[PDB]
Each structure stands twice: as structure tokens, then as C-alpha cells.
Structure 1
Amino acid sequence: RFTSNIKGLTQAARNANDGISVAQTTEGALSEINNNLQRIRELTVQASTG
């Protein structure tokens, strides 16, 4: 039983690491999308002048 448990926890730890990696990838994508949106807001503030 202890062997089964330790193997299961090891595999679970690897799965959690994989999830952390996918979350990191998503966060990077969202960060650069944020940069693009900030630049668009920059342009919009520029364009309001008559």
C-alpha cells in the first residue's frame, strides 16, 4: 500500500508541474496581449484631439 501511495504522489507532483508550465505559457500570452491593449489605449488618447 505504501509503495502504491508513493508512486501515486510522485506522478501527481509531475502532473502539477505540467499544470504550472501551461499556466506560465498562458500568463505570458496574456501579458503581451495586455501590452498591445495598452498601446491601443495610447493611440486612442492620441486620437481624441480635434
Structure 2
Amino acid sequence: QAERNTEDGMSLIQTTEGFLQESNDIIQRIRTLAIQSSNGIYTEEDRQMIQVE
């Protein structure tokens, strides 16, 4: 049963991790968008469109 407990823990951890892959892929996408936003000739109107995303 202790072995089972160890394994059930693995599933919790993997579930948690999957939500973190989603979350980190999000940051990487935000970073891509942040770089575009940091372009001083990229306009305020266009920056609003990026901020939607």
C-alpha cells in the first residue's frame, strides 16, 4: 500500500505539472508579445490589440 501511496502521489504531481506546462507556455507567449510591445514605433492602438491577447 505504501508503494501505491507513492504512485498516487506521482499522479497528483504530474497533474499539477501539466497545469504548469500550460502556465509557462503562457508566459513565453506573453514574453513574445512583450517584446513586440517594447518596440517604440509599435503604436498605442496596436499595443491595445496585443494587450487583448
More helix by share: 1
* Shift in Å, 1:49: 1.0
Q: Answer yes or no: is 1:18 the counterpart of 2:12.
A: no
Q: Which structure carries more relative contact order (alpha carbon 8 Å, separation 6+)?
A: 2
Identical aligned residues as a percent: 57
Structure 1 unaligned segments of length 5 or more: list them.
1-10
Aligned residues, how many?
A: 40
* Mapped pair 1:30 → 2:53: no
- When normalised by structure 1's length, the TM-score is 0.75
TM-score for both structures, normalised by structure 2: 0.72
Dislocated runs of 4+, deviation >4 Å = none
